[PDB]
Amino acid sequence: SQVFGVARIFASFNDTFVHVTDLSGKETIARVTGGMKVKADRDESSPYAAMLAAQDVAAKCKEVGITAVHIKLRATGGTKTKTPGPGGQSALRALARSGLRIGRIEDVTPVPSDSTRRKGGRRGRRL
RNA sequence: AUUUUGUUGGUUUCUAGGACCAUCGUAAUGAUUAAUAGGGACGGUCGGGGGUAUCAGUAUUCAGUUGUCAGAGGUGAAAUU
Ligand SMILES: [Mg+2]
Ligand SMILES: [Mg+2]
Ligand SMILES: [Mg+2]
Ligand SMILES: [Mg+2]
Ligand SMILES: [Mg+2]
Ligand SMILES: [Mg+2]
Ligand SMILES: [Mg+2]
Ligand SMILES: [Mg+2]
Ligand SMILES: [Mg+2]
Ligand SMILES: [Mg+2]
Ligand SMILES: [Mg+2]
C-alpha cells in the first residue's frame, strides 16, 4: 500500500525538531527544526514555527517518495520535564493536513527507572 | 564449776548442767497466688527492620559506527557556549 517513514518529533520548550527517518531510523530523510523558520529565540518552539517546520518536512518527503509516516513524539525526558513542548501538537496536525498519511502514534519520551540528580539545586530555581 | 571430806593447794572418779551427736515415737510433718506486672520456651505468621553477596531497569554523560544539513543550546528576553 503506502510507503512508510518514521517522523521522530522531539518537542522541547526551547525548540521543535521534526525529523523523518526510514523504518530503521538509521537513514535520515528530512530534518527541519522550528529554529530554521524564525529568527527569534523566544519562539523557536512556537506552534507557528512547528507548523512551518512540518510543512517543509512533508514537502521533502513527497519528492523522495514517502507517502505515510508513523509518529514517535518525545519530550526532553531524562532528568528534566516529561511533558512535550508546545510545538509537538502543531507539527503533528500540520503533517496530517499536508496530504501525508499517518500511521501509528507513540510517545517515546526518555523516562528514568530511577534518576540521576536534576539541575537547579535543593531549593529549586528561585525567581 | 554451783556444793563436802575438821582444812589450802586438792584430784579424778564421782555426782549435776548446758552444747552437740545417734535411735525411736509424735505430726494432716514442711513449698501462698500466677498480677489483662514482667522474663523465657514453642506455632503459624508479618514487615520498604539490619548485615553480606547477587540480579534487574531505564535514565544521565561519554565513546564508537551511521544518516542527513544550519543552526543547536539557554531564558522572562538574551548572552557566555
Ligand atoms: Mg530557544
Ligand atoms: Mg536562524
Ligand atoms: Mg544569526
Ligand atoms: Mg552543570
Ligand atoms: Mg517567587
Ligand atoms: Mg570446809
Ligand atoms: Mg501472669
Ligand atoms: Mg518465631
Ligand atoms: Mg522505556
Ligand atoms: Mg550564526
Ligand atoms: Mg535553541
Give the per-residue SS3 of chain A: CCCEEEEEEEECCCCEEEEEECCCCCCEEEEEEHHHCCCCHHHCCCHHHHHHHHHHHHHHHHHHCCCEEEEEEECCCCCCCCCCCCHHHHHHHHHHCCCCEEEEEEECCCCCCCCCCCCCCCCCCCC
- Nucleotide with smallest C1' distance to residue A76 CA: B59
Ligand number nearest to the C-alpha of A38: 2
Q: Check: CB of residue A52 under 8 Å from CB of residue A36.
A: no
Angle at A57 between CA A63 and CA A19, to 5 degrees: 120
Method used for this model?
X-ray
Q: Please report the resolution in angstroms.
A: 3.0
Cα-to-centroid distance, A74 and ligand 3 (Å): 27
**Nucleic chain B contacts, Cβ below 7 Å:** A 12-15, 26-28, 30-31, 33-36, 40-42, 44, 76-79, 110-116, 127
For residue A56, give the amino acid letter.
Answer: D
| Residue A38 cell numbers, joined | 524564525
